[PDB]
Each structure stands twice: as C-alpha cells, then as structure tokens.
Amino acid sequence: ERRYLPLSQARKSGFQMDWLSEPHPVKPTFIGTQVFEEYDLQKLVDYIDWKPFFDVWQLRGKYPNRGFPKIFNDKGEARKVYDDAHNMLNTLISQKKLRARGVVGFWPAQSIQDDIHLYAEAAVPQAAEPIATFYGLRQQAENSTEPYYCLSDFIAPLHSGIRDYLGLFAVACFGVEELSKAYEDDGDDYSSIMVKALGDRLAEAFAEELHERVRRELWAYCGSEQLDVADLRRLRYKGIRPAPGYPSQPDHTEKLTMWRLADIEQSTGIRLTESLAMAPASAVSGLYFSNLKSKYFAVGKISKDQVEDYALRKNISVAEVEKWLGPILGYD
C-alpha cells in the first residue's frame, strides 16, 4: 500500500534552487583532466579517518588468528594495532611498496530535467552536442512539503543563462593486494589484515585530501576554506562528492561514463571490473558538485514510470535498468 508520486509530479516538486537569484558558479582552474601518477602518502596519513580501522581490529581481534601479538590474549589492543599500523606505514611508504594514483577532471555542465550534460571547454552549451551525460534519479516515495531531490537539481539548467560545471575524481592505493598475499604466504595474517586496513584508510584519505584540494585550489570555489580534518569528517565544508552506486544515484553503470570521459584506466591504471567494482579495491571515486546547497540524500524506492523513463534516456532496456536498480524498485 506504499504510495509513490508519479514521475511528472515528483519533478514538479523537485528541489528548487531559484536560479534567477543564484550567484554564478565558479569556473574551475582548468577544463579536462589532471593526472597524478604519484601522490605524497605521508601527507595523506594526516587525513586518515582511524575509526573504520579500529572497527576492523575490534572485529578481527575477537577471534585472533594464530600469530597475533601476545596482547590479544589478555583480559591494550587498540594502542598495539595503532603503533603497528604506524610502523608499517613508515616502512611501506619509505620503501615505496605502496603508491597512490588519481585523476581529477572538470567540464562545463548544465541540467535538462533529471540529467546533467557536459560540454567541451570552448562550446556554447545551448549550441553544442554534449560530450557526456550523467543521468539522475529522483525521489518518488510519499510520506509546503519537502522537495523530491535529484542530483541534477544541483546544476544550473541549460536555459537558465548561468554557466555551470561538474567535476569528477578517481583515486587508488596500489600494492595492497600484492603485500597482503605476500604476508599470508609467510603465515602472517596479522600483517595481511593490517595492510588491507591501511590501504583502505589511504584511499579514503586521498579522496578527502583531494576533495579539499579541489574546493580550495583546483576548482577554488572556496579558496578561503580552512577546516581541520575532524571538521572534514563532519561535512562542515560545502559541496559534495557522490559516487555512482551510493544512495544519491544507485546506478553503478554511471561509472562507465566517468571512466570513458576522463580516460581513467589509461591514466591511472584503476580498472572497472565486470561487476563495476574498482580495481584495486582500495579505491574511491565520485562526481564533484560545487553548489553550497548541494547535499547527499537517498533516492529511495522508485516506480515503474521512472524506470521506463530512465531506460529511454539511457537507451537501455527496462530489464537492464531493473538489473542495476534492483534494490530500489518500488514494485514487483
């Protein structure tokens, strides 16, 4: 008996930016991509969010493998895993046994209804064929009233007379899978767990630091920003970096467009697997939105009308859309 608003009505009640009263989006410092063939891993250490790392060790530490430090047999563990993490980081960074690569890109962007079109640097968007499209999905489930969000709501309409921009990034830590296997071959499960956890921390730190670098320098829509790492975790900054597959746009296949547009694989070695997971696994990607009114949200469950409309926009079958949007189908 769950109620869903028909797509046309959800669109009429979409999030309204009031573009007539909006300031002009800032043009990024370049259009196209910038590639990082290496990155300063020591600098990233300061951006690490240690909570998920301690979560890993709480989970694994309850059932220690043979060969764990003696402290796991006590009635202390957090300090020991933290110190061991720092020793490993020092050794692996200095020996260059871990390395990071990434890419950032920016393009002119404008919205048409639920979708975001990107254009060539020198193009007049109204006069030009888009070079890429990032498709949006819109909230539909029922519960003035709150708007029905879609990521396209955060980008200026094609006909608004306002030029907008969209960015993207992909980052990864390389060497993790190889080191973990080597540790395991040596019978050292503790170090394997450790390097896997650290790889994840480094990739996320890279995403965080690079986002700050994008806000202040590369896009520079907030050049005066001066926030601590703790404030970054709390999302005290403006703009968002949502990745395909996450609740704001659950369609993983949007990664294909990111990879094509920014030539990500040939630029960074970061691959998309058949399930559209990133390889190496210690990797993060996303689209950058600069509007200070942008926010994360969950699309939530959607109706058949939106699935059909989305299929037509992407030129794929309903069955194909239903494969990738399975968990958010609001119908049988």
Next chain:
Amino acid sequence: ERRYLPLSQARKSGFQMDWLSEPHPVKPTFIGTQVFEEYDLQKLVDYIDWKPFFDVWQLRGKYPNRGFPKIFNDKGGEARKVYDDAHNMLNTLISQKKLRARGVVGFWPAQSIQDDIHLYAEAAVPQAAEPIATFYGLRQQAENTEPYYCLSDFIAPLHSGIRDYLGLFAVACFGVEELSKAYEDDGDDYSSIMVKALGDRLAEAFAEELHERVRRELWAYCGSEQLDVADLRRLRYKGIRPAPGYPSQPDHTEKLTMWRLADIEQSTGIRLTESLAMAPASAVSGLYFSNLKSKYFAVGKISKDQVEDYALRKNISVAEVEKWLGPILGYDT
C-alpha cells in the same frame, strides 16, 4: 608458498588443559532445555551495546531518505535525535507488546574425543553410552610455540575421568520485520531503520544478559560474578558463547545439530532458513563453554587432510565439506 602443519602434528601441538590440576567443571542446575516464552525487554535495554546502533545511523544519516527528521538537513544534532527517538520507540513498543522475545537454553553432559565434543544423556555414564549429539571441531593448521586451537580443547576428554558439560542458546526478538514493513508501508523509512536497529540491539542484549544469567544462575559456574555491562562487552567474564559459522568453527551446518538437540524451532519459533540463517533476523545463538581458559580464536585456513577427516567424522561427502568450508580452504579445489 604458505605452510600448513599436517593434521596429526597440529593435534599433537593442540591446546593442552592438563585436566587434573584445573578446577573441575560445574554441573549445571538442570540437564535438557529451559524455554523462555517471553522475556523482560525493559531489563534488556540496560544491556544494549549502543555502538553498532550509532554506526547504523552514521551510515544512513549521510544519505537521508525523504521524510527524515529536519535535523538531518543541518550542520551532534543527529546523534541526540536518534538516541532520544530510540528510547521513545523502545518504551512505546515494549509497553504495547509490539515486540516480544523468545529463547531457549540447554545443558548436557559433554566430553571430547580428539577434535570433537560428544554430548550424553543426564543419567548416562559417558564411557558406556552412545552420544545423543556431537559437536564437531576444527583445528588451526596454518604455520607461522603457540598451540593450535580447537573448540574441543575446552572440554574434558572422555577418558580423563572428569565430567564436563556443554550448553547452548538461541534467542530472538519477534515483531521487528512486521513493524519495519508497516512503517515502510506508511512511507516512514526513518522508523523502519530505527526498529530494525533496535531489534538487532535487543537480540544482542538478550544474548548478553542471558549469558550472564547462565554463568551466575543457570549453569552457576561463576555465582559470585558481578560485572557492569561495559565489562561484559570487554569479555571480562570467563567462558565463551561461540556460534557456528563464526571464525572459531566456520561450519554453519553445526546449527542443524543445535536445532535438533534442543528442539529450538518448536520451542521458540526461531527457525533456520535454507542458508542456515536464523529467522527472524534479530536473533543470536551459540554454544556455551564454561572453562576458565576457553577463548575465541580463528581456525584460519585448513588443509585437505583435515577436510577429509572432518567429512569422515561427520559422515558427509568431501564435496559438501568443501562447500560449507569454502572460505577457509588452504588449497585449490
């Protein structure tokens, strides 16, 4: 080229209790099962481990669904709101009997033979009797002075002349799935997430409080224990409550024996699904070990020799064992 000890050698270097000098196992206050048709949900609130609850809300709160409280759209505010909402929902659902808890505890004479634990009838002389059930063990085998653990190491050998015992439990919070669907039907995703999170918290609280009751009262091997809930989370008490499928014995099919022996489904309504998950989902089960020196551990990866021996002991095919123990096979199929 990862090294594994042959099974016979891993067994020779198993954890050795030295049973003559250790405190003798205490006979529980009953043999067989005790069923809880209802349980004091309010009492369980004090035993809640809130960390995983706050983790759920950190994850969901980043991407709020339409209809969430207005604070999710702001710049401490979220944690405050979800916690007060949690306590309000707990109070309302408990008082209105819209959630209810059921469970069962059982105890039986138990003795080990090598890697396995046999259970016996109350009046049986274990050396003279056919076991009424067997809980099979798996032993650490991967190489690195430390022993190679198996759960059976925590139970007195059949021929030690020392009588031992094993317990088990299964508990669940009923009503969670139904309330969640009802909330969702109205379009209230916030409350659906909340009740699911609370159901999980209550089931885990029931497991914790019941284990304490087992240690102090029902088994009563630690009748003089008095630990606060924070110390319970730190595993400051003695004895363990490992469940089939967890790293100490990754074979989920051992749940079938638990369910058969203690007549769990008919006693409590808690079922095992085709995948051997518990239904309802807000549920916890395990085996109770009372030994002062029992501890959780990960079996880790095992060799073909142990897979073949385990299959022989359980009277099942090697193919089936390799299916159930897939993740811990230390060799290629």
